[PDB]
Amino acid sequence: NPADNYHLARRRTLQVVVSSLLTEAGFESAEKASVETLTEMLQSYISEIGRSAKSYCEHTARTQPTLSDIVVTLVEMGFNVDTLPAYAKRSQRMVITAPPVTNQPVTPKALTAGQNRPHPPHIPSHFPEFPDPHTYIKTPTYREPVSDYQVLREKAASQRRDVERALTRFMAKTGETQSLFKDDVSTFPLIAARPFTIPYLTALLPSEL
Amino acid sequence: HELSVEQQLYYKEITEACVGSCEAKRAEALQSIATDPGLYQ
Amino acid sequence: RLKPRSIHELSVEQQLYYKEITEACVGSCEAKRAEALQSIATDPGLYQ
Amino acid sequence: PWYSIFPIDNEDLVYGRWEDNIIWDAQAMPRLLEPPVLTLDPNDENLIL
């Protein structure tokens, strides 16, 4: 979680500092509540020279503090500043490392490059570009229509020929049949010629009218 | 849209062959339905 | 009565996107593949 | 693709609830059914009109 790592990268650096300052001419294996006590007094001490040396310089109409604003800030906290050049030149002096950076890759993204659409004149050019079509563009689409007279004539012709062939083979198979050649019921079956009673009625009369 | 008389007659014969007058006409009607190429429409 | 001519559930920008992504993902060029693979890996509207 | 390359599926099968026509109990049938008119869908090819 990088949210609490904004605070815990610098407070757990102050925990290594107190653990390095309680080892210099001193302890090993301290109590746990005694370390979070002392690193709370350390954070509250840096934050108090921050607020008071800024207050002493801004009282003198300035914005960034000089040396004369901190040697009056440390006097008002009771520090006895003169003992500090001797403390800085210890042989036990140690350096605690700064915390690591979350964005170690820095630039690891190939990205997704998509451009479509422009800007209406109430949006200047420095605003981000309008995104791609899939985000908000919808058009219905239909099936490919075959309006060709050649293939429509071919389709109607072949369907009529196939249905009349199927009809005549079904009627020749389920009735009396004739055959020009011998053993010819499978190939070219003829519906047998059936006598009626009044042949002129089935000859001369129209059936579609 | 309306069936032509050819396929209207084919529909009539095929449906009335599967109502139960005899079994042989039913078997030939089902072998027609299963094995014809143009029965769409 | 004829039922209305239906439309495909993809847009033509979406259908063109599908055609470009599939013709890039058959790997004729490697940079084309890699973007198309990242596009598959993070397009939010790649459902449907 | 001024014409969709992908196949178009039956909107009724893909979307409609054909499960309201399943007759689970003949006597106690929940929805009163009605005669259906022929609709001759023109999306299907192989139909002249």
Coordinates of C-alpha atoms in Angstrom, one line a residue:
Chain A
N1 CA 0.0 0.0 0.0
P2 CA 1.6 3.3 -1.1
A3 CA -0.9 5.4 0.9
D4 CA 0.5 4.7 4.4
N5 CA 4.0 4.4 2.9
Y6 CA 3.9 8.2 2.4
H7 CA 4.2 8.4 6.2
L8 CA 5.9 5.1 7.1
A9 CA 8.9 5.7 4.8
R10 CA 10.0 8.6 6.9
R11 CA 8.8 7.5 10.4
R12 CA 10.5 4.1 10.0
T13 CA 13.6 6.0 8.9
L14 CA 13.4 7.9 12.2
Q15 CA 13.2 4.5 13.9
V16 CA 16.5 3.4 12.4
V17 CA 18.0 6.8 13.6
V18 CA 16.9 6.3 17.2
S19 CA 18.1 2.6 17.0
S20 CA 21.4 3.9 15.7
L21 CA 21.6 6.6 18.4
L22 CA 20.8 4.3 21.3
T23 CA 23.6 1.9 20.1
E24 CA 26.3 4.6 20.1
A25 CA 27.8 4.3 23.5
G26 CA 24.8 2.6 24.8
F27 CA 22.1 -0.1 24.5
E28 CA 21.3 -3.2 22.6
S29 CA 17.8 -4.8 22.5
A30 CA 15.6 -1.9 23.8
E31 CA 12.0 -2.2 24.8
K32 CA 9.5 -1.7 22.0
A33 CA 7.4 1.1 23.6
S34 CA 10.6 3.0 24.5
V35 CA 11.6 3.2 20.8
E36 CA 8.3 4.5 19.5
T37 CA 8.4 7.0 22.4
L38 CA 11.8 8.3 21.5
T39 CA 11.1 8.5 17.8
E40 CA 8.0 10.4 18.6
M41 CA 10.0 12.9 20.5
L42 CA 12.4 13.1 17.5
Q43 CA 9.6 13.8 15.0
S44 CA 8.1 16.4 17.3
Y45 CA 11.6 18.0 17.7
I46 CA 12.2 18.4 13.9
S47 CA 8.6 19.7 13.5
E48 CA 9.2 22.3 16.3
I49 CA 12.3 23.8 14.8
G50 CA 10.3 23.8 11.6
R51 CA 7.5 25.9 13.0
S52 CA 9.5 28.2 15.2
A53 CA 12.4 29.1 13.0
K54 CA 9.9 29.8 10.2
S55 CA 8.1 32.0 12.8
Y56 CA 11.3 33.9 13.8
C57 CA 12.3 34.7 10.2
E58 CA 8.8 35.7 9.1
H59 CA 8.6 38.0 12.1
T60 CA 11.6 39.7 10.6
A61 CA 9.7 39.9 7.2
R62 CA 11.8 37.1 5.6
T63 CA 10.7 33.9 4.0
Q64 CA 13.6 31.5 4.3
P65 CA 15.5 31.1 7.6
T66 CA 19.2 31.9 8.0
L67 CA 21.6 30.7 10.7
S68 CA 20.7 33.5 13.1
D69 CA 17.1 32.4 13.1
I70 CA 17.9 28.8 14.3
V71 CA 20.4 29.8 16.9
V72 CA 17.6 31.9 18.4
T73 CA 15.2 29.0 17.9
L74 CA 17.4 26.5 19.6
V75 CA 18.0 29.0 22.5
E76 CA 14.3 29.2 23.0
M77 CA 14.2 25.4 23.3
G78 CA 17.1 25.3 25.7
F79 CA 19.8 23.6 23.6
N80 CA 23.2 25.2 24.5
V81 CA 24.2 25.3 20.8
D82 CA 28.0 25.6 21.5
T83 CA 28.2 21.8 22.4
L84 CA 27.1 20.9 18.8
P85 CA 30.5 21.2 17.0
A86 CA 31.8 18.6 19.4
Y87 CA 28.9 16.3 18.8
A88 CA 29.2 16.4 15.1
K89 CA 32.9 15.2 15.1
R90 CA 32.3 11.9 16.9
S91 CA 34.1 8.7 15.8
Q92 CA 30.9 6.8 16.6
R93 CA 28.9 9.1 14.2
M94 CA 26.8 6.9 11.8
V95 CA 24.7 7.7 8.7
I96 CA 21.2 6.1 8.3
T97 CA 20.2 5.5 4.7
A98 CA 17.2 7.4 3.1
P99 CA 14.0 5.3 2.3
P100 CA 13.6 3.5 -1.2
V101 CA 11.4 4.9 -4.0
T102 CA 8.1 3.2 -5.0
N103 CA 8.4 4.0 -8.7
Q104 CA 11.6 1.9 -9.3
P105 CA 10.7 1.3 -13.0
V106 CA 9.7 5.0 -13.6
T107 CA 8.7 4.3 -17.3
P108 CA 7.5 0.7 -17.7
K109 CA 4.3 1.2 -19.7
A110 CA 4.1 0.4 -23.5
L111 CA 0.7 2.2 -23.4
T112 CA -2.3 1.9 -25.8
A113 CA -2.1 4.3 -28.8
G114 CA -5.7 5.1 -30.1
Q115 CA -6.7 8.3 -31.9
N116 CA -10.2 9.2 -33.2
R117 CA -12.5 12.3 -33.2
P118 CA -11.5 16.0 -33.0
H119 CA -12.6 18.9 -30.8
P120 CA -15.7 21.2 -31.0
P121 CA -14.8 24.9 -30.9
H122 CA -15.7 25.3 -27.3
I123 CA -12.9 22.9 -26.3
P124 CA -9.4 24.3 -26.9
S125 CA -6.5 22.1 -28.2
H126 CA -4.7 21.7 -24.8
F127 CA -7.5 19.6 -23.3
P128 CA -7.1 15.8 -23.8
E129 CA -8.2 14.3 -27.1
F130 CA -11.5 12.6 -27.6
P131 CA -11.1 8.9 -27.1
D132 CA -11.6 6.0 -29.7
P133 CA -14.9 4.9 -31.4
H134 CA -15.6 1.8 -29.2
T135 CA -15.8 4.0 -26.1
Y136 CA -19.1 5.6 -27.3
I137 CA -19.9 5.1 -31.0
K138 CA -22.7 2.7 -32.1
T139 CA -24.0 2.0 -35.7
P140 CA -26.6 -0.8 -36.3
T141 CA -25.3 -3.0 -39.3
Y142 CA -27.4 -5.4 -41.5
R143 CA -26.9 -8.6 -43.4
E144 CA -25.5 -8.6 -47.0
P145 CA -28.5 -8.4 -49.4
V146 CA -28.4 -10.4 -52.6
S147 CA -30.1 -8.2 -55.2
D148 CA -28.8 -9.7 -58.3
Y149 CA -31.2 -10.7 -61.1
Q150 CA -28.9 -13.5 -62.3
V151 CA -28.6 -15.3 -59.0
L152 CA -32.2 -14.8 -58.2
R153 CA -33.3 -16.3 -61.5
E154 CA -30.9 -19.2 -60.8
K155 CA -32.2 -19.7 -57.3
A156 CA -35.9 -19.7 -58.3
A157 CA -35.2 -21.9 -61.3
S158 CA -33.2 -24.5 -59.3
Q159 CA -35.7 -24.5 -56.4
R160 CA -38.6 -25.1 -58.8
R161 CA -36.8 -27.9 -60.6
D162 CA -35.8 -29.6 -57.4
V163 CA -39.3 -29.4 -55.9
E164 CA -40.9 -30.7 -59.1
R165 CA -38.3 -33.5 -59.3
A166 CA -38.9 -34.5 -55.6
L167 CA -42.7 -34.4 -56.2
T168 CA -42.6 -36.6 -59.3
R169 CA -40.2 -39.1 -57.7
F170 CA -42.4 -39.3 -54.6
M171 CA -45.6 -39.8 -56.7
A172 CA -44.0 -42.4 -58.9
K173 CA -42.6 -44.4 -56.0
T174 CA -45.9 -44.5 -54.0
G175 CA -48.1 -45.7 -56.9
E176 CA -48.2 -47.8 -60.0
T177 CA -45.1 -47.1 -62.1
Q178 CA -43.8 -47.7 -65.6
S179 CA -40.2 -47.8 -66.9
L180 CA -39.0 -47.3 -70.5
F181 CA -35.9 -49.5 -69.7
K182 CA -35.8 -52.8 -67.7
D183 CA -35.5 -52.6 -63.9
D184 CA -35.7 -48.8 -63.9
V185 CA -37.6 -47.7 -60.8
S186 CA -34.7 -45.9 -59.1
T187 CA -33.7 -43.9 -62.2
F188 CA -36.4 -42.3 -64.4
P189 CA -39.6 -43.5 -62.7
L190 CA -42.8 -42.8 -64.7
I191 CA -46.1 -42.4 -63.1
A192 CA -48.3 -45.0 -64.7
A193 CA -51.0 -43.9 -67.1
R194 CA -54.4 -44.1 -65.3
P195 CA -57.8 -44.3 -67.1
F196 CA -60.4 -41.7 -66.0
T197 CA -64.1 -41.5 -66.9
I198 CA -64.7 -38.2 -68.7
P199 CA -61.2 -37.3 -70.2
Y200 CA -62.3 -34.0 -71.6
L201 CA -62.9 -32.6 -68.1
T202 CA -59.2 -33.1 -67.1
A203 CA -58.0 -32.1 -70.5
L204 CA -59.9 -29.0 -71.6
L205 CA -60.6 -27.3 -68.2
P206 CA -58.3 -24.7 -66.8
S207 CA -57.0 -25.3 -63.3
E208 CA -55.6 -21.8 -62.4
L209 CA -58.2 -19.1 -63.0
Chain B
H1 CA -44.6 -15.7 -49.3
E2 CA -47.5 -18.0 -50.2
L3 CA -46.5 -21.6 -51.0
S4 CA -46.7 -22.4 -54.8
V5 CA -49.2 -25.2 -55.7
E6 CA -46.3 -27.7 -56.2
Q7 CA -45.0 -27.3 -52.6
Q8 CA -48.5 -26.8 -51.2
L9 CA -49.4 -30.2 -52.6
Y10 CA -46.1 -31.6 -51.2
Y11 CA -46.9 -30.2 -47.8
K12 CA -50.4 -31.6 -47.8
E13 CA -49.2 -35.1 -48.9
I14 CA -46.3 -35.2 -46.5
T15 CA -48.3 -34.0 -43.5
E16 CA -51.3 -36.3 -44.2
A17 CA -48.9 -39.3 -44.6
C18 CA -47.7 -38.9 -41.0
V19 CA -51.2 -39.0 -39.4
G20 CA -51.5 -42.7 -39.3
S21 CA -53.4 -44.3 -42.2
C22 CA -50.6 -46.8 -43.0
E23 CA -47.0 -47.3 -41.9
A24 CA -45.4 -47.7 -45.3
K25 CA -46.5 -44.3 -46.6
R26 CA -45.3 -42.8 -43.3
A27 CA -41.8 -44.4 -43.7
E28 CA -41.5 -43.1 -47.2
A29 CA -42.7 -39.6 -46.0
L30 CA -40.1 -39.6 -43.3
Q31 CA -37.4 -40.8 -45.7
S32 CA -38.5 -37.9 -48.0
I33 CA -38.2 -35.3 -45.1
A34 CA -34.8 -36.7 -44.1
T35 CA -33.3 -36.9 -47.6
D36 CA -34.5 -34.0 -49.8
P37 CA -32.4 -31.0 -50.9
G38 CA -34.9 -28.2 -51.3
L39 CA -37.4 -28.4 -48.4
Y40 CA -36.6 -24.8 -47.2
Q41 CA -39.5 -22.4 -47.6
Chain C
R1 CA -45.6 -9.1 -42.3
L2 CA -41.8 -9.1 -42.5
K3 CA -39.8 -8.9 -39.2
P4 CA -37.4 -5.9 -39.1
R5 CA -33.9 -6.3 -40.5
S6 CA -31.7 -6.8 -37.5
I7 CA -28.3 -5.2 -36.8
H8 CA -25.2 -6.9 -35.5
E9 CA -24.6 -6.3 -31.8
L10 CA -21.1 -4.9 -32.6
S11 CA -20.6 -1.4 -34.0
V12 CA -18.6 -0.9 -37.2
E13 CA -15.8 0.8 -35.2
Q14 CA -15.9 -2.3 -32.9
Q15 CA -16.0 -4.7 -35.8
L16 CA -13.1 -2.9 -37.5
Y17 CA -11.2 -2.9 -34.2
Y18 CA -11.8 -6.7 -34.0
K19 CA -10.5 -7.1 -37.5
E20 CA -7.4 -5.0 -36.9
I21 CA -6.6 -6.7 -33.6
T22 CA -7.0 -10.2 -35.0
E23 CA -5.0 -9.4 -38.1
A24 CA -2.3 -7.9 -35.9
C25 CA -2.4 -10.9 -33.5
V26 CA -1.4 -13.4 -36.2
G27 CA 2.0 -11.8 -35.9
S28 CA 3.1 -10.5 -39.2
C29 CA 5.0 -7.7 -37.4
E30 CA 6.2 -7.9 -33.8
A31 CA 5.4 -4.4 -32.6
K32 CA 1.9 -4.7 -34.1
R33 CA 1.4 -7.9 -32.1
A34 CA 2.8 -6.5 -28.9
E35 CA 0.4 -3.5 -29.0
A36 CA -2.5 -5.7 -30.0
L37 CA -1.7 -7.9 -27.0
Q38 CA -1.5 -5.0 -24.7
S39 CA -4.8 -3.7 -26.2
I40 CA -6.4 -7.1 -25.4
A41 CA -4.8 -7.0 -22.0
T42 CA -6.4 -3.7 -20.9
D43 CA -9.4 -2.7 -23.1
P44 CA -12.3 -2.2 -20.7
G45 CA -14.9 -2.5 -23.5
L46 CA -13.6 -5.9 -24.7
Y47 CA -16.6 -7.6 -23.3
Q48 CA -19.5 -8.2 -25.7
Chain D
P1 CA -16.7 -3.5 -43.5
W2 CA -19.6 -1.4 -44.9
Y3 CA -21.3 -4.8 -44.4
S4 CA -20.7 -6.7 -41.2
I5 CA -18.2 -9.6 -41.8
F6 CA -19.4 -11.5 -38.8
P7 CA -22.6 -13.7 -39.2
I8 CA -25.9 -12.3 -38.0
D9 CA -27.8 -14.6 -35.6
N10 CA -31.7 -15.0 -35.2
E11 CA -32.6 -12.2 -32.8
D12 CA -35.5 -14.2 -31.4
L13 CA -33.2 -17.2 -30.6
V14 CA -30.4 -15.0 -29.3
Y15 CA -32.7 -12.6 -27.3
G16 CA -36.3 -13.8 -27.0
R17 CA -37.6 -16.0 -24.2
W18 CA -38.8 -19.0 -26.2
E19 CA -39.1 -20.7 -22.7
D20 CA -42.6 -19.1 -22.2
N21 CA -43.9 -21.4 -25.0
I22 CA -42.7 -24.6 -23.2
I23 CA -46.0 -26.2 -22.1
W24 CA -45.0 -27.6 -18.7
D25 CA -48.5 -28.6 -17.6
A26 CA -51.4 -28.9 -20.2
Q27 CA -54.2 -28.2 -17.6
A28 CA -52.5 -25.7 -15.4
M29 CA -50.6 -23.6 -18.1
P30 CA -49.6 -20.2 -16.6
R31 CA -49.7 -18.0 -19.8
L32 CA -52.7 -18.1 -22.2
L33 CA -51.2 -18.8 -25.6
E34 CA -52.5 -17.2 -28.9
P35 CA -52.5 -18.3 -32.6
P36 CA -49.2 -17.3 -34.3
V37 CA -49.2 -15.5 -37.7
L38 CA -46.6 -16.3 -40.4
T39 CA -43.9 -13.5 -40.3
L40 CA -41.7 -14.5 -43.3
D41 CA -38.4 -13.0 -41.9
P42 CA -36.5 -11.5 -44.9
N43 CA -33.1 -11.6 -43.1
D44 CA -32.8 -15.3 -44.1
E45 CA -31.4 -15.8 -47.6
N46 CA -32.8 -18.7 -49.8
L47 CA -36.2 -16.9 -49.5
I48 CA -37.0 -15.0 -52.7
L49 CA -38.8 -12.2 -50.8

